[PDB]
């Protein structure tokens, strides 16, 4: 349903924004792994959570 997809997308962005604010929840070692392809740190963590 379009409602479920919209709800999931908005909630996911709120989590990512809060997680990466101030001191990030995820260490720099995991960011290096998730940014090997070329995607940014925020984007790499976002796909893994999904």
């Amino acid at each position: 349903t379009s409602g479920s997809i919209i709800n999931h997308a908005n909630n996911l962005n709120k989590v990512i924004n809060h997680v990466f604010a101030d001191k990030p929840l995820i260490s720099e070692t995991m960011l290096k792994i998730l940014t090997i392809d070329g995607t940014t740190g925020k984007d790499g963590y976002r796909n893994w959570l999904d």
């Binding site: 349903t1 379009s2 409602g3 997809i5």
Partner: protein
């Protein structure tokens, strides 16, 4: 491209024959994929809704 042939040779060739030619060469992308239907609703507000 994948098999050494020209357009005039592969003319008058059915889909099944072309699929067999590509699979033997080692090419697996020879099929179409259907898309899933996402069920959408629009909230009524003043209008009846859709």
């Amino acid at each position: 491209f994948l098999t050494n042939t020209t357009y005039d040779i592969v003319n008058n060739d059915t889909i099944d024959v072309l699929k067999m030619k590509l699979r033997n060469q080692g090419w697996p992308f020879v099929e179409r994929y259907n898309a899933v239907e996402i069920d959408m609703s629009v909230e009524p507000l003043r209008s009846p809704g859709q």
